[PDB]
Design a protein around this ligand. Structure first.
Ligand SMILES: Nc1ncnc2c1ncn2[C@@H]1O[C@H](COP(=O)(O)OP(=O)(O)NP(=O)(O)O)[C@@H](O)[C@H]1O
Ligand SMILES: Nc1ncnc2c1ncn2[C@@H]1O[C@H](COP(=O)(O)OP(=O)(O)NP(=O)(O)O)[C@@H](O)[C@H]1O
Length: 627
């Protein structure tokens, strides 16, 4: 509807939908939503030629070549030259109208939010302006590579105070308690469903992102699409929200691990934030890290080469870990740094040797060689204070190295054991109070107004420890950051606890109680999770921690430490006996140290004599009769 100029523009838009034949792949009714959005931002900061410019921007958001963008700006631009295209960049009368953004960009206005150390290169500013040009209309989805920072750009734009970037990181079996939210009771009452993360962003602002929705748990996808029936109305028993504008973004991945719905991929104004360029990253790391001309440049080139040799790990978040970790001042030392950080996740020696060549193109305990290259890595990652997982064989040395470091760095390794409430009690509790405070209320009344007695509590209630008295919340990592938290078997941990741990992870701690933000004096989450309900976390939540993978006669020496006083050479038989049992039964060259451990237990529990008969009955008890 809303000149003969616009009739020439009708000819231009028709030329665009006619040059649809320049090859799904910019399908039919995308032009309809594009015309709707052109109508949307029409008077709101727009020339009609600029309206079609921003419109066909979202006709070529997810594309291959910008010669279509060249012809599209040629059409719209012609309807509206290099000076004219610069006049399209005049945001001045556009922004004259809602907290504005930089250029072709004046969004809405909310917590007062401001900038960051999030320095932006050319292609980054391009995609940022793209997502911004999306972010004035009102759904939106943004697929691609995870290490390239989709929510990095999303929060870089949320820095301009559209809202906060509530990154709901659904891993693999995220249920409705993550989305709709339910909560603990009260001081006395019940209060079953008393919180939210999606519905909280539905009531308030704080622009949510149901991230990683590629691996959705197969029904919250369905109820979330039920929430994409109405605009911002959420029925959960209790009817609706009807929000103001924050955003409603979402992020799948580079698309066969459970491919998303094409109906869902045709119900939102989608986007494809493709990977950042190479020298783009070379510039990007030069400020957020300390910069070296060739150490930094070659690391980016090595990331490119690791891409060039090509669900394992190649995350550039770990490249930032490699950068800020490397305190080298030496190209060989930095080579070893990027090596070992890349040699963290080595699930096989083949790819380890391959990456080694690619980089080459650029105390109560017992010492041991094959665990020294776990203890040294955990020591180094402790010095960097990075988040440090540990993955591998169930019973390989994990708690040993952890207690070894807590021996060496004198510390209080508060350990835990996962698989409800105690997972929250890693962060915080709410138990019934040990009633020493019930008698401390007598001193609290002795420090109370109008004191000369529960009748005195009534008298001070006439004119908050009284409410503490009427009510009858610490935690393990709260105690840790107060005073290393080794939450072993982290794969079977919680999700909301893992959510706050993700908030606890990246270079900052937080105590999401009415809440605060905890400090960190060395509150390491020196966790573990053995390989293999062994559902891994979000690939961010894996990638947000510097992991480590792990696996001779020293097993016999270890048993010699593990055994009784004299009682010696039976294990030297028992070691090779386990070896021949291993190659014979269930053929593999693993010492299977649960078995040898229980055998050393019974052998040091031999209340009888005749050593070889003890080992006879022992290997009968553990290995032999099991077969
Ligand atoms: N421009 C930038 N400036 C500084 N750091 C950046 C920048 N871009 C990315 N990063 C960092 O690189 C990582 C990007 O990953 P992240 O910000 O988690 O996005 P993401 O992995 O897609 N999270 P999500 O989208 O919810 O799955 C983070 O550690 C950022 O701090
Ligand atoms: N060099 C060593 N010095 C002392 N003990 C060792 C050494 N190497 C291995 N061990 C022991 O071998 C076992 C290795 O298990 P470890 O992973 O450390 O704890 P774990 O509980 O068995 N792991 P997991 O069972 O998966 O939770 C422990 O009993 C260690 O004491």
């Amino acid at each position: 509807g809303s000149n003969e100029h616009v009739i020439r523009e009708v000819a231009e838009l028709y030329q665009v939908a006619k040059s649809l034949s320049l090859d799904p792949h910019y399908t039919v009714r995308t032009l309809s939503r594009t015309l709707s959005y052109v109508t949307e931002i029409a008077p709101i900061y727009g020339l009609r030629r600029s309206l079609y410019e921003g419109f066909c921007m979202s006709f070529l958001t997810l594309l291959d070549h910008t010669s279509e963008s060249l012809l599209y700006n040629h059409v719209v631009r012609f309807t509206l030259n290099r000076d004219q295209q610069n006049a399209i960049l005049k945001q001045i009368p556009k922004v004259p109208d809602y907290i504005a953004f930089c250029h072709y960009w004046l969004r809405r206005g909310p917590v007062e939010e401001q900038e960051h150390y999030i320095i932006t290169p050319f292609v980054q500013k391009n995609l940022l302006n793209i997502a911004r040009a999306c972010s004035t209309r009102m759904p939106i989805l943004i697929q691609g590579p995870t290490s390239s920072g989709k929510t990095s750009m999303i929060e870089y734009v949320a820095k301009k105070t559209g809202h906060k970037f509530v990154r709901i990181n659904n891993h693999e079996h995220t249920d409705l308690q993550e989305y709709i939210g339910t909560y603990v009771t009260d001081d006395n009452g019940s209060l079953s469903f008393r919180e939210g993360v999606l519905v909280e962003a539905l009531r308030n602002g704080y622009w949510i992102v149901l991230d990683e929705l590629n691996l959705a748990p197969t029904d919250v996808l369905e109820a979330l699409n039920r929430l994409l029936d109405d605009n911002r109305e959420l029925f959960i028993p209790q009817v609706l929200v009807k929000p103001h504008p924050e955003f409603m973004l979402f992020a799948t991945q580079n698309p066969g691990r459970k491919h998303l719905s094409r109906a869902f991929r045709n119900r939102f104004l989608e986007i494809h934030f493709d990977d950042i360029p190479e020298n783009e990253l070379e510039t990007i790391l030069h400020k957020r890290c300390k910069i070296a001309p060739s150490y930094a440049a070659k690391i980016v080139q090595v990331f490119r080469e690791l891409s060039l040799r090509r669900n394992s790990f190649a995350t550039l978040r770990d490249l930032f870990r490699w950068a800020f970790r490397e305190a080298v001042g030496y190209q060989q030392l930095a080579e070893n740094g990027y090596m070992l950080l890349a040699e963290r996740a080595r699930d096989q020696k083949d790819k380890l040797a391959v990456q080694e060549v690619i980089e080459k193109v650029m105390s109560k305990v017992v010492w041991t060689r094959p665990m020294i290259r776990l203890f040294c890595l955990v020591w180094r990652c402790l010095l960097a204070k990075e988040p440090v997982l540990l993955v591998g064989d169930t019973g390989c040395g994990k708690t040993t190295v952890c207690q070894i470091l807590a021996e060496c760095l004198h510390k209080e390794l508060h350990i835990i054991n996962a698989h409800t409430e105690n997972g929250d009690i890693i962060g915080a509790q709410r138990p019934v109070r040990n009633r020493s405070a019930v008698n401390y209320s007598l001193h609290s009344q002795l420090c109370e107004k109008f004191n000369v007695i529960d009748d005195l509590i009534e008298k001070f209630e006439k004119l908050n420890l009284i409410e503490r008295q009427i009510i009858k919340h610490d935690g393990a990592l709260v105690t840790a950051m107060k005073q290393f938290f080794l939450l072993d078997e982290i794969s079977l941990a919680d999700d909301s606890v893992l959510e706050r741990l993700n908030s606890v992870l990246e270079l900052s701690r937080t105590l999401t109680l009415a809440v605060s933000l905890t400090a960190k004096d060395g509150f390491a989450f020196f966790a573990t999770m053995n390989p293999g309900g062994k559902k891994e976390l979000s690939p961010a939540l894996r990638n947000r921690f510097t992991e480590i993978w792990v696996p001779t006669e020293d097993i016999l020496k270890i048993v010699e430490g593990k055994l009784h006083n004299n009682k010696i050479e039976l294990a030297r038989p028992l070691v090779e006996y386990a070896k021949w049992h291993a190659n014979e039964y269930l053929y593999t060259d693993v010492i299977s140290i649960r078995d040898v451990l229980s055998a050393v237990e019974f052998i040091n529990a031999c209340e009888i004599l005749d050593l070889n008969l003890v080992l006879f009955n022992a290997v009968s008890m553990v290995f032999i009769d099991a077969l």
